[PDB]
Amino acid sequence: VVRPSIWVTPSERQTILNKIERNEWAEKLFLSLQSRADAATSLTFEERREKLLDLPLVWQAPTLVTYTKKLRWGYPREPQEKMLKGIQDAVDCSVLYYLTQQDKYATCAADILAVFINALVQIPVNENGFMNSGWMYQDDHLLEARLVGAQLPIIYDFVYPFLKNGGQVLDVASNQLVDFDFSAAQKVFETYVYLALNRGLLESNWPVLESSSLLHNIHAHDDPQKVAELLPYYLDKNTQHQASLAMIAEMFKEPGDIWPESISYSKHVTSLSVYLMTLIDRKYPHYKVGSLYSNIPQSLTAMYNLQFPNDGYPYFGDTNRFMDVDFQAYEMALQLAKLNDNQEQIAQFSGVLRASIQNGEYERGKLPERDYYPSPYILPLTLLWSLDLQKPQRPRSSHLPHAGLTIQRNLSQTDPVKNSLMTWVGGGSYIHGHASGMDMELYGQGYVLGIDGGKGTYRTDIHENYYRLFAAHNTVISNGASGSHGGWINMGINQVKTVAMEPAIDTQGASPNHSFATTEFYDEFNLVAPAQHQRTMALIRVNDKQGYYVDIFRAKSKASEEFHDYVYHNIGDAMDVVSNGRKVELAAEPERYQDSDKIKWEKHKAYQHPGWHFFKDVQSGKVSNQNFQVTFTANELEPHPIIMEAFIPEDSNIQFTQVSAPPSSAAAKPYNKKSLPSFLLRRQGEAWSNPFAVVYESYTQDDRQQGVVRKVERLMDDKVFKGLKVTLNVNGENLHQYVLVQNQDDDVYKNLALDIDFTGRFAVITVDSAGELLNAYIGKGHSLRYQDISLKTDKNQAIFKRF
Ligand SMILES: [Ca+2]
Ligand SMILES: [Ca+2]
Ligand SMILES: [Fe+3]
Ligand SMILES: [Mg+2]
Ligand SMILES: [Mn+2]
Numbered sequence: 001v002v003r004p005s006i007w008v009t010p011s012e013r014q015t016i017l018n019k020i021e022r023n024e025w026a027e028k029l030f031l032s033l034q035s036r037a038d039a040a041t042s043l044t045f046e047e048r049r050e051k052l053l054d055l056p057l058v059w060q061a062p063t064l065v066t067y068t069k070k071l072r073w074g075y076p077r078e079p080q081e082k083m084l085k086g087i088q089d090a091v092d093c094s095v096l097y098y099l100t101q102q103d104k105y106a107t108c109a110a111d112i113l114a115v116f117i118n119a120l121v122q123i124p125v126n127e128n129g130f131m132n133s134g135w136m137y138q139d140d141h142l143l144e145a146r147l148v149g150a151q152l153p154i155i156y157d158f159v160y161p162f163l164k165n166g167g168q169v170l171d172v173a174s175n176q177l178v179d180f181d182f183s184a185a186q187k188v189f190e191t192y193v194y195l196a197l198n199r200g201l202l203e204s205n206w207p208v209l210e211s212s213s214l215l216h217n218i219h220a221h222d223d224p225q226k227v228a229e230l231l232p233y234y235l236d237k238n239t240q241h242q243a244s245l246a247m248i249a250e251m252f253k254e255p256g257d258i259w260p261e262s263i264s265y266s267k268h269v270t271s272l273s274v275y276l277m278t279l280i281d282r283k284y285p286h287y288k289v290g291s292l293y294s295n296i297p298q299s300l301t302a303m304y305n306l307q308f309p310n311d312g313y314p315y316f317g318d319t320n321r322f323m324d325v326d327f328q329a330y331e332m333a334l335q336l337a338k339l340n341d342n343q344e345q346i347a348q349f350s351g352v353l354r355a356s357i358q359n360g361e362y363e364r365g366k367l368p369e370r371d372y373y374p375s376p377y378i379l380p381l382t383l384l385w386s387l388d389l390q391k392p393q394r395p396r397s398s399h400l401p402h403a404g405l406t407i408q409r410n411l412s413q414t415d416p417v418k419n420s421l422m423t424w425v426g427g428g429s430y431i432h433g434h435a436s437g438m439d440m441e442l443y444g445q446g447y448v449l450g451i452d453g454g455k456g457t458y459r460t461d462i463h464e465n466y467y468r469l470f471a472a473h474n475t476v477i478s479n480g481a482s483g484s485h486g487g488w489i490n491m492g493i494n495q496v497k498t499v500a501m502e503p504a505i506d507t508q509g510a511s512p513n514h515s516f517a518t519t520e521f522y523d524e525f526n527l528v529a530p531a532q533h534q535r536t537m538a539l540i541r542v543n544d545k546q547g548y549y550v551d552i553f554r555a556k557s558k559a560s561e562e563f564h565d566y567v568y569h570n571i572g573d574a575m576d577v578v579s580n581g582r583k584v585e586l587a588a589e590p591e592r593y594q595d596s597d598k599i600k601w602e603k604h605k606a607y608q609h610p611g612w613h614f615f616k617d618v619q620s621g622k623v624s625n626q627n628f629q630v631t632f633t634a635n636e637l638e639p640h641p642i643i644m645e646a647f648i649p650e651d652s653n654i655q656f657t658q659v660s661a662p663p664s665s666a667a668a669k670p671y672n673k674k675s676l677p678s679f680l681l682r683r684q685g686e687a688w689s690n691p692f693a694v695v696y697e698s699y700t701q702d703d704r705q706q707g708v709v710r711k712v713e714r715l716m717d718d719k720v721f722k723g724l725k726v727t728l729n730v731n732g733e734n735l736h737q738y739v740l741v742q743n744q745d746d747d748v749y750k751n752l753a754l755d756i757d758f759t760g761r762f763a764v765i766t767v768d769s770a771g772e773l774l775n776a777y778i779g780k781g782h783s784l785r786y787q788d789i790s791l792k793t794d795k796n797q798a799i800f801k802r803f
Pocket of ligand 2: 518534535536552553554
């Protein structure tokens, strides 16, 4: 084997040198990396030994500190940071040696490597049979593979030319120059390969986390026949303790799929897989894993298309709202796409990179500081690999199957951050998922306002018995008892399924100002009686600055008695409620939700569904057929207050309750530490023929118009709900939108007073104050008649007409 071979080859060196000559960003990375290498080099022979005595030596060669069971990852912080400083110094110097061929760098790097190799071969491998037993980390191979195993073979691959041609290392014990122990290094590389294949979980992200150690140590074997004999155990052969790439790709079956957890956990699997795939296709041009498994790099775009207009992510499960763009993953996915002749990916990835350089989000010449995070050290590849390069729009609807998730977005032409509309609805069974039911979030005014209830500290009472349960989510609880079962630690719920939607995925709508999606969810694991749930949400844009959401939620239990609760949470520090325009009299009801506290919590096993005993400041009205208007006010996000209005129509036959929910981590700072204003609408009996209905609209209190929605009323056909009448006021003028909503694709609606006929599921009619038809939208339907006008639907059962 000619070396280096793993990250780079000798024949690539001038190409890299030329990129530094011709590109400012590359020279700046080179100079920063060189400044780190230089700090580790030594001027004198005594300083050479000093650097090795900085390592966590145990005193013929010394060993290193071993880790069993001021603390980091659960082990003494102090030796680990000495170790990691050493290892990463050595990688940086070994890259500077490749680039400059100055021996001062090779000697620094190989001295450190020699200390690791000579120490490890004296330490017994842990044969207590525990599946995550390691070597230096007697009880954590997973950690060791990320911190140590992946890095030693790289150093070796860069310093090999120096050592094979008579270079020597400083034997720290004797203070003598001595030959590198190549036989001992082979045994280290053999042992980390064995460990990756015979330690760890097989069905998990663990094999991916272990794959840099596996693939690097395979290629540091001195026999090319053995290298090729071992390579299949990354590419496509599994063991009891290791998934191959081919098996990992089964979790990216369809374009648009991602590693099936929450976004924050899912992102790491894409980062690492893209690195490993690029390594393979750089070195072995015939495998073309970037084509065979192009859904893996595609997960970058899949995640991009989930984002809100303010770059935040849907907060489903144990996740975060904001996560830095993974520019290193884009740099390598762009190289992978070039190697594999994938033009759509070339365009997208270079489009994200170019846009982020243009707007100053990505400083391509800035070398990140070492975080000493537990992941393979690949910082130098910024320079060594990234291509000389000489924003993509998100679709109106997106779907993510594993999370049962559907996005509707309607972007403004002007101030998109403030004025765009976006919702997602979802729910399903996956690791780091919640018993969310069929839940949702609502965007407005630069922020996610209708928010998921957040996450707690793992394994705590409030995390398992509130944050992960239904009452923490914008959904319906049925029979006071909606819950979960099986799957991941009894968190399992059924998938949310799409019934209909328009525009369909990755298409343009019939109408630029209208969309809807109807989804359904079986609340099978209810402690009292299963319930069927169905939800219709629509995004109605009135103009480039104003728009609103319609939320219709049906629930029906398989039982002769039932009740249902509709739950909404919204960021704020103030919440006000009126009914028929007047202040509501709410009575304190501190015990309302306390019966679920009688359920016995068994950690990791049984939970106090639905979690609402954790609400505070509980205050309830009477059963009412009056309307309600809730005003949420957030005073601490922007200089002017940000308002969400919720219009609950008359004849909803609900009891209104206001609560303060536990603080939510999905809320923008400083509200992540503040109580979360919330309401519940309780219906006695079924909630299907006359379902929950709410209209949401946001605005910023400097806004000229404030909100355009002024009234919301039910369209009722003999106790059966058929939609809503929304009264708008736009630049002083009154308009009416009739939002027609039926439960069957062939249902026929006749409203004699309005002179309307509609056959279909979802439509929206817009008329002026005199009743003139301005435009009509059929999202899913056959026929519409308003007065003397009649419309028919094209393909897809949708149409839009202006008059
Ligand atoms: Ca493994
Ligand atoms: Ca519905
Ligand atoms: Fe936000
Ligand atoms: Mg009341
Ligand atoms: Mn949640």
